[PDB]
């Protein structure tokens, strides 16, 4: 049992479905606003992941144009949502903050 922590998770699953990037085949990290830290982390991704990212965005911008979504079966499931960028961006912010700390002394 973890009754609260699965309703606090079920709101999230609800929100995710309401956000609807998954309708356009997208993953959460595909929708992030590209600032310097993000642009850096996109830069640091390995070939396979970067290539997969570009395709998703192309397919998303394609549908967004024809004003469509994917069939239901082919949407991104909340569970199957690979948070592939987070560790890269975590490292870039961690690096930046060390700079910002060194700039203080």
């Amino acid at each position: 049992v973890s009754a609260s922590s699965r309703w606090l998770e079920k709101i999230r699953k609800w929100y995710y479905n309401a956000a609807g990037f998954n309708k356009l085949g997208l993953m959460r990290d595909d929708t992030i606003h590209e600032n310097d830290d993000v642009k850096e982390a996109i830069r640091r991704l390995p070939e396979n992941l970067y290539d997969d990212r570009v395709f998703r965005i192309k397919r998303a911008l394609d549908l967004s144009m024809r004003q469509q979504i994917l069939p239901k079966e082919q949407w991104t499931k909340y569970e199957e949502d690979k948070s592939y960028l987070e560790p890269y961006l975590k490292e870039v912010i961690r690096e930046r903050k060390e700079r910002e700390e060194w700039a203080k002394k």
Binding site: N48, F55, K58, D62, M65, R66
Partner: protein, 48 residues
């Protein structure tokens, strides 16, 4: 107060008849130009 009354309404009919001919025709011009994009098929073929 408004002498032009008849003329505007005469012109307004011509405008409506013109737009009724023009609006579907420009839309048709747009669609055919945009069709190259609206039927485009993508395929991703990553290596290995």
């Amino acid at each position: 107060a408004e002498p032009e009354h008849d003329h505007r309404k005469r012109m307004g009919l011509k405008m409506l008849l013109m737009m009724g001919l023009l609006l579907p025709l420009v839309y048709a011009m747009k669609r055919h130009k945009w069709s190259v994009l609206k039927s485009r098929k993508l395929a991703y073929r990553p290596p290995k």
